[PDB]
Amino acid sequence: ISSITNTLNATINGFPVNIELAQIIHALSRYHTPLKVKNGWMSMQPSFEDN
Amino acid sequence: EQVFLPPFLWDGEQAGGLANLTSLTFNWVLNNNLARIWSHSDITNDVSGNSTIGSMNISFQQPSMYLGFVTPRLNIPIPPRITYPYFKLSRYTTQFQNTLAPNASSTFKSNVVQLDSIPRKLYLFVKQSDNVIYQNLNNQITTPDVFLQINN
Amino acid sequence: MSNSAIPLNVVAVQEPRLELNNERTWVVVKGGQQVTYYPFPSTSFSSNQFNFICNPPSAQTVLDRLVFIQVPYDITFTANPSHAGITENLLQPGRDAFRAFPISSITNTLNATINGFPVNIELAQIIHALSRYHTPLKVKNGWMSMQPSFEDNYQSYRDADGANNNPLGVFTSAAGLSELPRGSYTMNVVTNTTTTARITGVLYEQVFLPPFLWDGEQAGGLANLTSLTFNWVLNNNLARIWSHSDITNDVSGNSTIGSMNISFQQPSMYLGFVTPRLNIPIPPRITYPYFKLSRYTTQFQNTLAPNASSTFKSNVVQLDSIPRKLYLFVKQSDNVIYQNLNNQITTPDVFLQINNLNLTWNNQQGILSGASSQNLYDFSVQNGYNKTWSEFNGVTQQFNGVSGQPTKVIGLEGGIVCLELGKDVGLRDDEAEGVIGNFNLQVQMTVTNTNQYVTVTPDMYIVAVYDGTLVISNTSAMASIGVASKEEVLNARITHGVSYNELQRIYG
Amino acid sequence: MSNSAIPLNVVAVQEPRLELNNERTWVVVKGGQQVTYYPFPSTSFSSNQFNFICNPPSAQTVLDRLVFIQVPYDITFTANPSHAGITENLLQPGRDAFRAFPISSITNTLNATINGFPVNIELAQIIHALSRYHTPLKVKNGWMSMQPSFEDNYQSYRDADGANNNPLGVFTSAAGLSELPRGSYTMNVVTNTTTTARITGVLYEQVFLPPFLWDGEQAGGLANLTSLTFNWVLNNNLARIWSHSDITNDVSGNSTIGSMNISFQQPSMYLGFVTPRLNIPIPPRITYPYFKLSRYTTQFQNTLAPNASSTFKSNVVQLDSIPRKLYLFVKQSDNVIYQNLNNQITTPDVFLQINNLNLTWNNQQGILSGASSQNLYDFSVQNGYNKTWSEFNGVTQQFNGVSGQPTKVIGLEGGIVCLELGKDVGLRDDEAEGVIGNFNLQVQMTVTNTNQYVTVTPDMYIVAVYDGTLVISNTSAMASIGVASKEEVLNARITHGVSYNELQRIYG
Amino acid sequence: MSNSAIPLNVVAVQEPRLELNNERTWVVVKGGQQVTYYPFPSTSFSSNQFNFICNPPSAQTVLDRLVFIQVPYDITFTANPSHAGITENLLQPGRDAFRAFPISSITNTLNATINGFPVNIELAQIIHALSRYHTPLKVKNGWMSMQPSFEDNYQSYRDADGANNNPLGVFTSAAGLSELPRGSYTMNVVTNTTTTARITGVLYEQVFLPPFLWDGEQAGGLANLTSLTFNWVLNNNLARIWSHSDITNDVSGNSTIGSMNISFQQPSMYLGFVTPRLNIPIPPRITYPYFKLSRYTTQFQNTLAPNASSTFKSNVVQLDSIPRKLYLFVKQSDNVIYQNLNNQITTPDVFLQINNLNLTWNNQQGILSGASSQNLYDFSVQNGYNKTWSEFNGVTQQFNGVSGQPTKVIGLEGGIVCLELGKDVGLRDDEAEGVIGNFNLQVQMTVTNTNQYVTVTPDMYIVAVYDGTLVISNTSAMASIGVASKEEVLNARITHGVSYNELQRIYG
Amino acid sequence: PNASSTFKSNVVQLDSIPRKLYLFVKQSDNVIYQNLNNQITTPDVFLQINNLNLTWNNQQGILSGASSQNLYDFSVQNGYNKTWSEFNGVTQQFNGVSGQPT
């Protein structure tokens, strides 16, 4: 889902905070999930990084 | 899929949740191709050129969102005003030419980018350019997301 | 004066020529010394993203409203195998120009943050509907002149040749003091032979999002910034930028032009800072108007043939405050137009003829269901629609003279109705364009495809526009929607001093 | 500021950018809930007149002032024996189209009755003169766009073809952002083959006559009232609706088309009734602006041609007050131009060019006896004439190439002058725009015919337009012309509050 | 309302259809008793210079500021020996007409004198850049219509032919409702045959001055003066009135037209006089805005063509008082293009395109230096440039189909940057548009040659305009510049009462 | 081969006034590195400066008015050691034989 997302904006208590998901995630994804945590919440979406 | 971006988390370890809020709202917006959802492997691609798949159609139905409100015990009171650690991430891309093939080297430099405070950390890498590979359902489906090898 | 049904009050004005008497006062216009322009070559500019980060030299300088980014570029075409030849040379005088407007129609998003607090438009879609809706031959020739700007009439370019009004025309063939067609832009052609072309130039796109203003009106500039930034991300496809025609392309669907490679060169934003003079001081805080615009779309999967009707139920949506206004139209659905290079350069973005629009607001339903197909046009021209009803209908006949051929019917374009929320919707008392919040809207609307040649698989849109103050203190950036309140909106004493036409004039 | 002959009072304004400090007031727009529309169909429509009895939904429900009607029609033609004709289809590609504006041009009279009290205008001959007069391109592309809207430039169709501004010419071939010629109008053509043709579609029209507004600006809608009614009593001819160029008919004028017949299907008016919100109350009785049109005419026996001079004398009349505006001109004679169908079809609107006009007010002679024609034009333009001087007094030479062909002159329509009877004529003291009455007038004016191939028996016209306030009440409607008593007109105290150019704005 | 950081005060506004009720007044409009017009046949006139003297009937009789003079003439062309060939007539249907504005571009210097005191405009060089500047489509179509009007857009006549908009074209071939080409104006031809041409008719042209106004917005009229005289003088060659094209003139040879000759009769000014009604008296002495325009020019003999830029610098000049604005431009040089008939007739009036400006001001250097040329445009349009960004900024490419032609480039005139002085320069504190005394400024900028056919030797101008008050009294004419005292200007009160864009209408 | 253009640099803040400062346009580095042929056979030289205008802090237009030849005058004074002819470099030698361009 997120590899298709352009941007994801959320606003909390009236003030906005945004990321840019499409670009960041694959690079952000390798840090810094120990094995235990790739089996953790990561588990819900497909997660095997393209080696 | 998990909502990413701080202060919302996606890791081992829990932390003290936001309160006291009055509002929240989560707007997505997804870039236009939607063919990047699926993958492919080009072994099955025809020998001369072409692919079996072209073309594909993607839907979505109303998507719910799941969150958990924990009210707290009357006796223990929670502060009127309170502070959370929040990070804020930014990207800067710069395409370079010419292309290198099939396995040769070159060097690249970037124009000075000036920031407003020392960042916590700074990632760097060299990805296969997006301007290419957004041609064709086929290319978009087949190609992997891995970077190029930094030799220095 | 009296001696009418109720006695009225007298006053007398003088003819223009007389009136030599009245108190005449010399006026000194003072504007703080040092109005100046700096350019900020974008850091980190790439096909996918532009990004400028600029800082005002000092506090106490007001930033002028009009901002724009000039982006020099490079395109290369190539002859597709192999319907061709293919004579004579891809590029023709009638057949191909920039789309209008070339850079903004390619931007997926324009995020831009003042003093820390982020603001953004979803430029890509919004622009083409919002271009028609404000401005008059006057503005058109003012600032809106810098990008290619003659917006498309004809339902498919193919037939459009060769006419005075055809949008991809040369500078010759455009009557004096009119919107010159899009081919009238200048980019040098380094080469155009058969089988290969390559052009080069520099094109300006002014950045749309409010507070920054495109319309020719001016107004206070937002001092006092401490930091500022602009960023755009561009829809990857990027072939859209060029607008081509079908007449040369021919019987087998296959197109002369496919394909092409666009590059860019490091562009610069160009914004300029007045710095006020020590005599007059400015306030420590201030408040500006701002308009968050946002779009919802529903995309259908049925398809109607050339000259055929149908209905489309909207798909529901919850809003946050009653918008200031709300436009509606149904377009050619991109989901299909994007696949294939030929199909995205040769298809013009023009809409579909709206027969009846019946929409639902805030629990009651069935508003306007009795209005004329044409009536929709009249309460929208009230808002400045600026295109004749003949073209809004829109369809055309043109009978031939010679035995004994059929006459050719031309699709011309579509209506895009917009109904101001207080004006033609009506809101139960205690409601006004500010006030929050939580209501719902769903537009059930019947339509007809006019275009002869292709099956338009359709789609809907609705571009809302909210009304909110934005307060800028240094350092802060509060933003609001719902400045008025429930007790506040009711029982607010009316003012005759203004001046209603005036409210139309401050556009957002 | 001081130091300048007599010392003057200094002020200083801020520049537009730097105008950052002043009081800002969030200004909430209220417009009562329930704007809704209705389509009353007319039982008792026929070939001879249309009738609409309809009524407001209730009292306390403001009727919106713009009102229009749409009618579906049906026409057939049939080729004329004998002609050394013809080839190869009757309806030609750019030679024929509706006279503009169509329905309102064939209406002998129109008559409305607001709340019992009848108001009526003479549509046939009052329209063409009034229409030229207050329409910037801005207003021309607004509401008027509905019914065919391009006025006749050329003195005779036969010359027009094929021009860039040819009045009756196809949609393609008119410049971008401008008035489309009348050939653009959408209608379904069943046939068009040689010897016959049959066309059919729906075509719009607006109600004219005040308080209903043809011009686009919008103001307080006239209500409360109990019953409303219209009667478009047409004229006997009906074949006049169509226009067709002389070019095709051959030898002695044997128009191919003769002869045609029309038809009609149930018509239908359209009005919109907003209802006001509960808090703010409307009053019991209010007072409206209110005009009245009237035309005096005189027929002459002699005839001048092809381009000889002459002169004419008005013919003494009385008017009950001094009217607000006057229009003057010498269009073609209606006694002729009706008999014989082909002739009736071909003749264009345009007037004979005015060379010198010298007029009588009451007991004042030669009110303007020494003004150059340029002088006459200038004031009409100041009033709002909206045509280039070269088109006024129209005669354009056009050089010829090739040895040795003589240079062919073109006729281009005459001028229609107007005096605004306070500013231009000059009124004697104590007497104002309103006051009644009994004043004498007659106008003598030298014209020159300019047409090339027809001999015109001229005819003079004057259109007086009175001002006055009408009080609509529940339920009886008073009216007045000349509300200001003679004395209250003199010794009224001038007000620099409002500018004159604001009054320029109010009426059509 | 009080929802923001600072509570901001509320007001409600009644939406336009429900504007009622509010107290309404009947307004009586009072013009002066007698309004008149008379021609003044120039009391003395000849070949190289003519003039009028036309005293007002009495003091106590206001006069219309809108003035104009009508001049009847005779031109006859002889066929030049011996350009080879010559078949086809001497005049062509699309290839020649009067240069616009015909009798203004002849005039060396207008000169009036109000009431014993002299005011003067040098008219020839000044008019072509001033005229670009303030006309929109309403105005270009009003009074400004009388003389041939259409400014010259194509950088070089020859290639213009034959576009719909071609500067010189006939009335047919102009778009419906828009500025018509120069060939539309009526001049009767007594004879046009190869070898010889003779043509004869009247032509109107206003007095362009201050006080007297050329734009419509009406303003108060000159009372109470005793003497008025106008003086004119013709810039020598005078063949310049006419225009032409290269296409007809033939290969490595000479034009066919040279030489011609001209001739006038007695031309007559046209003044209006309104004598005000007995009720309201006119004040003993009265004060009028009065702007005077200068020009400062520079020649540098060297040459560049067809397209390579260099820098030119303008000799430092002094001003007596910060002028209210100043224009800058480069253009073809006057010293050439005066010698030789061909050179005089067929070379259009247009400007090289400005690549970037870099003026200095007392002393500084460089204001406006670092702004993209693009940027000069969009800050000039703010003062009313009125020409598409592409018309400004010179050339536009154009490709053809057929292998292998070269792709033809077209030059089409470069803009003229104009900057208001408070608005865009910024003055050091306590100097404002009136203030005296001493300053000097030298603009220096770079410009690239646009057109393809000839080498352009250039020149550049600087037209400064001074704004002050003039006191027409009885009897005198003290004229004041430097109305605001410097200390005075420092501490003048700021009123939000009068909006700024309001002061953009006063012009002059 | 010999067109004229304009450029700019992103703003770059400094932490102090520097004693000296050197501006020059080089044949860009990135294009010379690829390829053996190119790396060896390209001399390291600069393009002729038609005009230089720069802005000191929050101040603009400096040195804009001075002729490019003036740039030389105050820089040789700094110690430039190279004939004006080579600065702004381009030279014309004409050959003497008919049917030949210089």
CA distances from E350 to E129, E140, E330 (A): 9, 19, 9
Q: Rg of the Cα trace of chain C?
A: 26
Which residue of chain D is at minimal alpha-carbon distance from C377?
Answer: D143
For residue F10, the chain B residues in CB contact (below 8 A) are 111-114
F75 touches chain E (CB under 8 A): no
Give C245's contacts (C-beta < 8 A, 6+ positions apart).
Answer: C94, C95, C96, C157, C158, C160, C161, C168, C346
Please choose, from the candidates D174, C182, C145, the residue with its C-alpha nearest in 3D space to the C-alpha of residue E387: C145
Q: Is D442 exposed, middle or buried (0-12, 13-18, 19+ CB in 10 A)?
A: middle
Structural contact between residues C359 and C442, judged by C-beta atoms closer than 8 angstroms: yes
Among left, alpha and beta (phi > 0; psi -120 to 50; other), residue E490 is alpha
Which chains lie within 8 Å of chain F at 3 or more CB pairs, if any? B, C, E
Give the span between the Cα atoms of D423 and E218, in whole angstroms.
12
> Residue E159 is inside which H or E element, if any?
helix E157-160
The alpha helices in D285-330, defined as continuous H runs, are: none
> Residue E26 is inside which H or E element, if any?
strand E25-30
Give the span between the Cα atoms of A51 and D286, in whole angstroms.
82
The closest CB to that of C390, out of D12, D95, D145, belongs to D145
> Which neighbouring-strand residues pair with C446?
C356
DSSP E242: B
Give the span between the Cα atoms of E57 and E272, in whole angstroms.
11
* Best mutation target, F8, F10, F57, to test chain C (most C CBs within 10 A): F10
Structural contact between residues D228 and D131, judged by C-beta atoms closer than 8 angstroms: no
The closest CB to that of F34, out of B106, B111, B113, belongs to B106
CA D440 to chain centre: 26
Structural contact between residues C84 and C269, judged by C-beta atoms closer than 8 angstroms: no
Give the span between the Cα atoms of C327 and C126, in whole angstroms.
10
Give the span between the Cα atoms of D164 and C274, in whole angstroms.
48
Please choose, from the candidates D326, D307, D318, the residue with its C-alpha nearest in 3D space to the C-alpha of residue D462: D326
The alpha helices in C211-254, defined as continuous H runs, are: none
Please choose, from the candidates C43, C98, C172, C37, the residue with its C-alpha nearest in 3D space to the C-alpha of residue E374: C37
Please choose, from the candidates C446, C442, C457, the residue with its C-alpha nearest in 3D space to the C-alpha of residue C312: C446
Give the span between the Cα atoms of C156 and C266, in whole angstroms.
35
Among left, alpha and beta (phi > 0; psi -120 to 50; other), residue C285 is beta
Structural contact between residues D175 and D164, judged by C-beta atoms closer than 8 angstroms: yes
Is the Cβ pair B111, C48 closer than 8 Å?
A: no
Cis amide bond preceding C259, omega within 30:
yes
CA C63 to chain centre: 24
For residue F60, the chain E residues in CB contact (below 8 A) are 369-370
Structural contact between residues B97 and B106, judged by C-beta atoms closer than 8 angstroms: no
For residue A18, the chain B residues in CB contact (below 8 A) are 5
Structural contact between residues F85 and F93, judged by C-beta atoms closer than 8 angstroms: no
Vertex D225: Cα angle to D223 and D226 (nearest 5): 150
Tokens read off for E226: 């005793």
Give the span between the Cα atoms of C155 and C144, in whole angstroms.
23
CA distances from C374 to C369, C463, D145, D150 (A): 13, 21, 11, 20
Which residue of chain B is at minimal alpha-carbon distance from C49?
Answer: B93
User: Given CA atoms D123, D129, D133, D139 in this order, what sign does their dihedral have?
Assistant: positive
The closest CB to that of A41, out of B2, B27, B123, belongs to B2
CA of B73 to nearest chain C CA: how many angstroms apart? 31
Is the Cβ pair A7, C118 closer than 8 Å?
A: no
Give the span between the Cα atoms of D130 and D144, in whole angstroms.
13
Q: What are the respective helix, strand and coil percentages of chain C, to the nearest 5?
A: 10, 35, 55
Give the span between the Cα atoms of B53 and E194, in whole angstroms.
74
Give the span between the Cα atoms of D204 and D150, in whole angstroms.
15
Tokens read off for C307: 């000259």
Give the span between the Cα atoms of E394 and E419, in whole angstroms.
20
- Amino acid at residue number D75: I
Query: How does E386-409 read in b/e, with b if 16+ C-beta sit within 10 Å?
Result: bbbbbbbbbbbbbbbbeeeeebeb
> Residue D70 is inside which H or E element, if any?
strand D68-78
> Which neighbouring-strand residues pair with F46?
F26
Residues in chain E followed by a break, C to N above 2.5 angstroms: none
DSSP B138: H
Please choose, from the candidates C176, C173, C286, the residue with its C-alpha nearest in 3D space to the C-alpha of residue C224: C286
CA D82 to chain centre: 38
User: Given CA atoms E208, E214, E220, E222 in this order, what sign does their dihedral have?
Assistant: positive
Tokens read off for E148: 């041939």
Query: How does D341-377 read in b/e, with b if 16+ C-beta sit within 10 Å?
Result: bbebbbbbbbbbbbbbbbbbbeebeebbeebbbbbbb
CA of D13 to nearest chain E CA: how many angstroms apart? 6
Q: What DSSP string describes C357-390?
A: EEEEESS-EEETTTS-TTHHHHHHHTTT--S-HH
> Which neighbouring-strand residues pair with E204?
E70
**Pairing state between β C9-14 and E25-30:** parallel
**Sheet harboring D188-189: ordered strands across?**
D37-38, D268-272, D68-78, D196-206, D188-189
Give E52's contacts (C-beta < 8 A, 6+ positions apart).
Answer: E40, E42, E43, E69, E229, E230, E268, E269
Q: Do at least 3 CB pairs under 8 Å connect E with D?
A: yes
- Amino acid at residue number B54: G
C36 touches chain D (CB under 8 A): no
For residue F65, the chain E residues in CB contact (below 8 A) are 358, 360, 365-366, 444
Q: Is D81 exposed, middle or buried (0-12, 13-18, 19+ CB in 10 A)?
A: exposed
Which residue of chain E is at minimal alpha-carbon distance from F68?
Answer: E311
Q: Where are the beta strands (DSSP E) in B22-152?
A: 24-30
Which residue of chain A is at minimal alpha-carbon distance from B12?
Answer: A37
CA distances from C11 to C456, E39, E276 (A): 61, 36, 18
> Residue E424 is inside which H or E element, if any?
helix E421-424
The closest CB to that of E370, out of F51, F53, F65, belongs to F53
> Which neighbouring-strand residues pair with D472?
D477
The closest CB to that of C17, out of E220, E389, E426, belongs to E220
CA of E251 to nearest chain C CA: how many angstroms apart? 24
> Which neighbouring-strand residues pair with E198?
E76, E191
Is the Cβ pair D6, E494 closer than 8 Å?
A: no
For residue C237, the chain B residues in CB contact (below 8 A) are 32-33, 134
Please choose, from the candidates C321, C338, C283, the residue with its C-alpha nearest in 3D space to the C-alpha of residue C459: C338
Among left, alpha and beta (phi > 0; psi -120 to 50; other), residue D73 is beta
Q: Rg of the Cα trace of chain F?
A: 18
Structural contact between residues C38 and C271, judged by C-beta atoms closer than 8 angstroms: yes
- Give phi and psi for E62, each to the nearest 5: -60, 155
Is the Cβ pair A16, C118 closer than 8 Å?
A: yes
| Method in brief | cryo-EM
Dihedral, CA of residue C28, residue C31, residue C34 and residue C40, to nearest 10: -150
CA of C347 to nearest chain B CA: how many angstroms apart? 17
Structural contact between residues E357 and E104, judged by C-beta atoms closer than 8 angstroms: no
CA distances from C174 to B133, C92, C132, E178 (A): 40, 18, 20, 11
Structural contact between residues D288 and D465, judged by C-beta atoms closer than 8 angstroms: no
CA of A16 to nearest chain C CA: how many angstroms apart? 7
Vertex C55: Cα angle to C54 and C60 (nearest 5): 145
> Which neighbouring-strand residues pair with E406?
none
**Residue E143: strand, helix, or coil:** helix
Which chains lie within 8 Å of chain B at 3 or more CB pairs, if any? A, C, F
Give the span between the Cα atoms of D322 and D315, in whole angstroms.
17
C8 touches chain D (CB under 8 A): yes
Structural contact between residues C198 and E399, judged by C-beta atoms closer than 8 angstroms: no
For residue C225, the chain F residues in CB contact (below 8 A) are none
Give the span between the Cα atoms of C497 and E20, in whole angstroms.
14
Which residue of chain C is at minimal alpha-carbon distance from E406?
Answer: C192
Which chains lie within 8 Å of chain D at 3 or more CB pairs, if any? C, E
F36 touches chain B (CB under 8 A): no
Please choose, from the candidates E365, E352, E315, the residue with its C-alpha nearest in 3D space to the C-alpha of residue E447: E352
Tokens read off for B15: 């932390």
CA distances from F28 to D43, D211, F2, F53, F88 (A): 84, 74, 16, 21, 18
Tokens read off for D250: 């051959």
CA of B6 to nearest chain A CA: how many angstroms apart? 8
Tokens read off for E439: 């300053």
Which residue of chain D is at minimal alpha-carbon distance from C495?
Answer: D27
> Residue C117 is inside which H or E element, if any?
strand C117-121
Other beta carbons within 10 angstroms of residue E299's beta carbon come to 12
Which chains lie within 8 Å of chain A at 3 or more CB pairs, if any? B, C
Cis amide bond preceding D249, omega within 30:
no
Q: Is F58 exposed, middle or buried (0-12, 13-18, 19+ CB in 10 A)?
A: middle
The closest CB to that of E19, out of C137, C172, C500, belongs to C500
Give the span between the Cα atoms of C20 and D226, in whole angstroms.
49
Give the span between the Cα atoms of C377 and C393, in whole angstroms.
9
Q: Is E126 exposed, middle or buried (0-12, 13-18, 19+ CB in 10 A)?
A: buried
Q: Which of residues 453-492 of C touch A (CB under 8 A)?
A: 479
Please choose, from the candidates D131, D462, D425, the residue with its C-alpha nearest in 3D space to the C-alpha of residue D329: D462
Structural contact between residues E223 and E282, judged by C-beta atoms closer than 8 angstroms: yes
C49 touches chain B (CB under 8 A): yes
**Residue C45: strand, helix, or coil:** strand
Q: How many residues does chain C have?
A: 508
With tokens 């496919």, the residue in question is C258
**Residue B102: strand, helix, or coil:** coil
F58 touches chain E (CB under 8 A): no
Give the span between the Cα atoms of E326 and D180, in whole angstroms.
40
> Residue E374 is inside which H or E element, if any?
helix E373-380
CA distances from D56 to C503, D62, D228 (A): 30, 9, 7
Other beta carbons within 10 angstroms of residue B6's beta carbon come to 14
Is the Cβ pair B112, F10 closer than 8 Å?
A: yes
With tokens 């062309």, the residue in question is E77
Tokens read off for C208: 């749309």
Biggest alpha carbon distance in chain A?
41
* Best mutation target, C10, C15, C23, C433, to test chain E (most E CBs within 10 A): C15
Give the span between the Cα atoms of B20 and B71, in whole angstroms.
11
Give the span between the Cα atoms of D144 and D139, in whole angstroms.
7
Structural contact between residues D105 and D127, judged by C-beta atoms closer than 8 angstroms: yes
A20 touches chain B (CB under 8 A): yes
CA of F3 to nearest chain B CA: how many angstroms apart? 22
The closest CB to that of C108, out of A6, A15, A18, belongs to A6
Q: Taking chain C, what is the end-to-end CA distance rounded to the nearest angstrom?
A: 43
Q: Is E108 exposed, middle or buried (0-12, 13-18, 19+ CB in 10 A)?
A: middle
Which residue of chain D is at minimal alpha-carbon distance from E480?
Answer: D4
- Give phi and psi for F69, each to the nearest 5: -85, -35
Structural contact between residues D230 and D207, judged by C-beta atoms closer than 8 angstroms: yes
Dihedral, CA of residue C136, residue C138, residue C140 and residue C146, to nearest 10: -160
Query: How does D309-320 read in b/e, with b if 16+ C-beta sit within 10 Å?
Result: eeebebeeeebe
C437 touches chain B (CB under 8 A): no
Query: What is the number of alpha carbons within 13 Å of residue D215 lying toward its C-beta?
Result: 17
Structural contact between residues B56 and B38, judged by C-beta atoms closer than 8 angstroms: yes
Give the span between the Cα atoms of E104 and E129, in whole angstroms.
13
> Residue D110 is inside which H or E element, if any?
strand D110-114
Q: What are the respective helix, strand and coil percentages of chain F, to the nearest 5?
A: 20, 5, 75
Q: Rg of the Cα trace of chain D?
A: 26
> Residue D506 is inside which H or E element, if any?
helix D503-506
For residue E175, the chain C residues in CB contact (below 8 A) are 164, 175-176, 178
